[PDB]
Symmetry: C5
Amino acid sequence: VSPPPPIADEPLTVNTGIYLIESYSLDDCAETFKVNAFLSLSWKDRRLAFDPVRSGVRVKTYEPEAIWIPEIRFVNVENARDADVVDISVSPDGTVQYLERFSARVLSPLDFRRYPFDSQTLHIYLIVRSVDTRNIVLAVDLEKVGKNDDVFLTGWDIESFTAVVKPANFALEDRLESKLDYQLRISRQYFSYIPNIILPMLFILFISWTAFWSTSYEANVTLVVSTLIAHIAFNILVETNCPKTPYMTYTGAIIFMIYLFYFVAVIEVTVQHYLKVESQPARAASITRASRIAFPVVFLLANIILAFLFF
Amino acid sequence: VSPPPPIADEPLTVNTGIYLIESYSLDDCAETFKVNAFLSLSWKDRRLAFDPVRSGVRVKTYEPEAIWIPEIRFVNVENARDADVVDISVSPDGTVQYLERFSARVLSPLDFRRYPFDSQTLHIYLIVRSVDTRNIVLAVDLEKVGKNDDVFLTGWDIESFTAVVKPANFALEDRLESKLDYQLRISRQYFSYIPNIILPMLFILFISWTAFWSTSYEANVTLVVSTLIAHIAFNILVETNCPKTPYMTYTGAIIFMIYLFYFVAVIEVTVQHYLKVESQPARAASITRASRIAFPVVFLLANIILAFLFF
Amino acid sequence: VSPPPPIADEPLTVNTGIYLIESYSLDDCAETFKVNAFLSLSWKDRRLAFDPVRSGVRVKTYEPEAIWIPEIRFVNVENARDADVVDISVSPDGTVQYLERFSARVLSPLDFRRYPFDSQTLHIYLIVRSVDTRNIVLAVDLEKVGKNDDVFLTGWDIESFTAVVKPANFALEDRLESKLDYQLRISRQYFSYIPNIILPMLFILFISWTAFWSTSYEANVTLVVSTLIAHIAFNILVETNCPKTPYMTYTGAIIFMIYLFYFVAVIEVTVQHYLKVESQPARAASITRASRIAFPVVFLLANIILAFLFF
Amino acid sequence: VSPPPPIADEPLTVNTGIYLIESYSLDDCAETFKVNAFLSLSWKDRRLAFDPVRSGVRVKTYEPEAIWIPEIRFVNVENARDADVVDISVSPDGTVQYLERFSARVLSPLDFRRYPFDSQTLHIYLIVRSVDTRNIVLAVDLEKVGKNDDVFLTGWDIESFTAVVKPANFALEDRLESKLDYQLRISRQYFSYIPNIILPMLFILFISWTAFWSTSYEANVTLVVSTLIAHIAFNILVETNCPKTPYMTYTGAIIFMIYLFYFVAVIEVTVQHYLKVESQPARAASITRASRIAFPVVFLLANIILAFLFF
Amino acid sequence: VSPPPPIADEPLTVNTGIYLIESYSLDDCAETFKVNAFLSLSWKDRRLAFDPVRSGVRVKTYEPEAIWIPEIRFVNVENARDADVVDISVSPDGTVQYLERFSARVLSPLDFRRYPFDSQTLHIYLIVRSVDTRNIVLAVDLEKVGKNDDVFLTGWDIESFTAVVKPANFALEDRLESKLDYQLRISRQYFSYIPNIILPMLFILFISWTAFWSTSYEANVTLVVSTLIAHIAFNILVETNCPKTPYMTYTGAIIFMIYLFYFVAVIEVTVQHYLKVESQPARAASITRASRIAFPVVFLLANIILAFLFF
Ligand SMILES: [Cl-]
Ligand SMILES: [Cl-]
Ligand SMILES: [Cl-]
Ligand SMILES: [Cl-]
Ligand SMILES: [Cl-]
Ligand code: NA
């Protein structure tokens, strides 16, 4: 119950590996995801070496309390992971094959700038603090890094689960820390977004454009203002945005533009009626006729500009 | 505290059985369900085998710490199950009969394509990882697989609780893993859906169709746009869909179609008024008269097409 | 740490009692309630017999680990109860008097057919599994069954807390199980329902009926459609129903009828205007005049029919 | 260990005290509040008495396991408190001074009859159960009852934290129970309620009253019905009431009255238009002119009656 | 397992330090934030001093139970922190260097008066209670105080993490207590507040001002009342305020003013129509023309006054 002694001056290498069993509860608002996985740890403790002939066993099994085990922690977790040691195996040379099953709620920042056509890299940071007698360094055993084929997150395509093999070794509170980056790459399943969110939102906006084929101010006021209520109501219904994001998203810009279009359509309807009442029906009719083309064209153009800027 | 030795080279068979005591908290949005059940385990350990004549006991009772017990885990659980060992009995031949009561929040994907006329198969996957000295294989004791008659899930008919007797044996992290599939078959109780969701949603759409028996543009605009607000408001009220499903559901298609119908009804109302104002009342009146039949017929037909496509 | 031996071949009787300290968090949607209570247990274990003279003490106190205690579990709980052993007293004959304070989230189905004039029977099922050496049977000590006078559930009248003295003894997984039914009878406090939910919902419906004293189609369309929006909005506000109940409730039928009435009132308004525009003001005026009586009468009648059918 | 022996036949007095460190999470809907505090306990155990000269110490420190400690529980808690023993000190005469830090979610009924001008008394009930050897009685050490100056509940003024010094001693399940009542007196901070809820609600109602300076039935219908929608929408926004309170509150009565006023204003608007259309403009104009004074006067009067009845 | 003895009569100095690893879940409504950090502790215990020559080691490692460790608690936490002792190192002179990793939900009051242009100071209060044999005093080791560069709170800029080096020593329950103040300074980054909440809210208000270029009372009533509904609906959608803050915020005043402006615009529309109907079109037209300038000017001025008063 002391770290294994060095042969020369070299640090202790703890070979790690995470195998995803379950991925669930991805909360876009909280920027958190719950994970259920295997954590494999491999290191050499020569004090544990044995002759397989004199022992009669090819492998030795130990209880966690019986031998020295490195304190591996996760950096970006809410609380410490719930762990259950599955197996501890010692081969004749003193190599330890530690395996545990754990569950953890991981905190990983999400970039919503390209939502709902966004891809995310979820992070799981492994860490080890170096001790008094010797330095502890983390390594990746890519044979031990993987994910179950049945792993799923609803509304996401899981591209890959990999690790950045080079650890981040740095000093913290006068000791070395070896940090590893495990990455879960996911891309959003944006199909139902068109018929469920985009298309009905566009229909509501198009209804407000019918005011360009009407001279009735009362009917026009009802058209633009009632559709604005319908738009807001629809947004409450589809709740596309989490509590307001601090930065400007792609969908966020489109939505802002839709509010601007409802305001401009009101200005037009107001201008039309005023000119019509102030004995100038030639201008009122020419503006309304221009708007019939101006509104869809300016919308389609601004959308192309936005799609270009974000992608 | 080592696995039982093989008589030849055969793997150890752990006979399993799950008996549902309680089923509750089925969450459609989270795709999870909470279960409270018995887990029975049976395996042969000849080190525990005894002669009854020289021992004088029917069965020997042991504490979990006293003997070797296989590490059975669940694949699709949020956290490790809360277990309470009920009984451990050993018969003269060394057959260990283990029983525990557990509670677990199970993650099982749900198919909403046919909602609210859907049926689901809830899964509970048992798993065992083989050890150094011998391979462990799972089996189903059908006598010990069942459910309490009082087991219920509000709004669901619990059809059956069975297990796929053939385990899924595969290699994972250089060891054999034996997986079992326990299935809970449930079918939704869709009756109150007609009077609570469908019928009021159809009434709001039918109100919009009264615009086909009116020439008043102001009254027509109020009819189609105000019913669209009422439709959206109603959807907020009945909250029939969870946060957006990535795929197209049956109810999802009907709802999309209802939004399309509100848009088409606006187009008609717009066309009719324009023709009337542009001194063409013959064309306007003929369109409105056609719409009176076209709208219910196209709706009833498209619904038949959708119901056919999904079922 | 083995069950007490039988004097003859008789089963071991465990006398139970539950005394409610606090009842809280009744969740109508989840069909669950949280309870805080005393669980008293009593049985004879003659191995614990002592002479009060040689011991000095008239009663002996033990730690739970020191003696055999029956494994009592609750059938309908989310997880196993949080228990705190208050006292364990052994009298010279070997009679054990066990007392624990526990908290548990109990799952009990609720019948909303007569809401908000409903009464419910909340269940707490005690259970004991029989052992190898002897059968265990549960019994009710009525002196030990009760509830604190201050026990409350907001919006409910707590009628009684009793137990069905005859246990339900049955075989499960080749062993006897003795089950007890503890019942908490509650009846809803429906007073504020009239001024808070019923009356404002009726006012909105009555506003729609003012269209029967108007010939203005535009004002009538605004009356019936805007009140329909107000009705839906009001329902969102008072959120009277949990996520859709699988069965048809009393309030559910009234609400369905209110939607039907808004649809019929639209049909009338549509018919009246069509007859007026189609040069038939005699027929239009006679329908509108009939509706003035027909609508309140048919409503009042259908409500009497519904109240009769449900109660 | 067993309870300290009586010198005569007197019960054991356990002097208590609670010092609030943190008060947080006051939930009006659940009628629950979370508390973080010190629990001090003092009693005399002559078996623990010592000579400070022969011992060399003026005070003795013990571990909880080393000595007898009374089992103090809280009556109105969700689950048993999370406790951490801070200190146990024994003086030469055998006086035990126990101190622990605990956190607990307390269940305390709230009276909303005078909301938002309400004051509440939050309760924390301490309890001790007597043993066969001797009766245990609770007492209040007022020097030990207090609260941190920084203790706060947002939107509340914390008046005082005191205890009812006389315990409630009663028999329960054949043993004496001594109960103490700790009271946290709080009064609501109702200032932002005027500009945030009342004034905008009143504005909407006043907007409906402008229909008394208009003869346009279409404009009047839009005024009263659209403001009713705005009123309902506003109440959804400010969510002033928890899930329906079983009793009639002050705000509840005002809100009911506001719905009644919207109904009466519709009746007036209906009556005025009917009289106008039925060639009686003298009667219509006289009603509308009366309403201009009748509506604000009846409102202001009924509000005075309500304020009087509730306060 | 007794505190270290004083060389003279001096109190024991416990040098503290907190290093933020993760900061997450800042809840504005609850006034809480979850933190994951290192807690370093250092004090002198001469009973632990050793000769590095006779021992062979330069540093000694101990288990928490092997030595005396001061009981450090946090004042403003929901429950006691989840702690995991990382390392305990003793140097030859008896200096103990303790390190633990903890997670805690911290309660810290938030000032929303300047939202969303507000800055907050989050507090973490360390505390130690003095013992019988000697007084314990806290100190700050600034070398051990810091935060990870990757530490983030979405929508916030983390300015600094520091500690007030002078402890607050006071008396509590007859013992001296030493308290430390750790401060996390954060400033709200809400780049998107203007486009996401302000501008759509101003557009709705501006739409209501188009009633100043219209004489149609029916169109004006629809303009001001429908925009009021749109405003309320928008506020339900953007949910900018937590459950009503007891004090008046900056955004709170702006929103109150917006409701006042909707009321004044209704008064104008009412006055204008009354004057028109009461054969005074000169006075009506002059008011409406004044309002065109009066409304934006009074709005822009009052906003400058508010921005001045709050900042
Ligand atoms: Cl961890
Ligand atoms: Cl498990
Ligand atoms: Cl239980
Ligand atoms: Cl407690
Ligand atoms: Cl703490
Ligand atoms: Na309208």
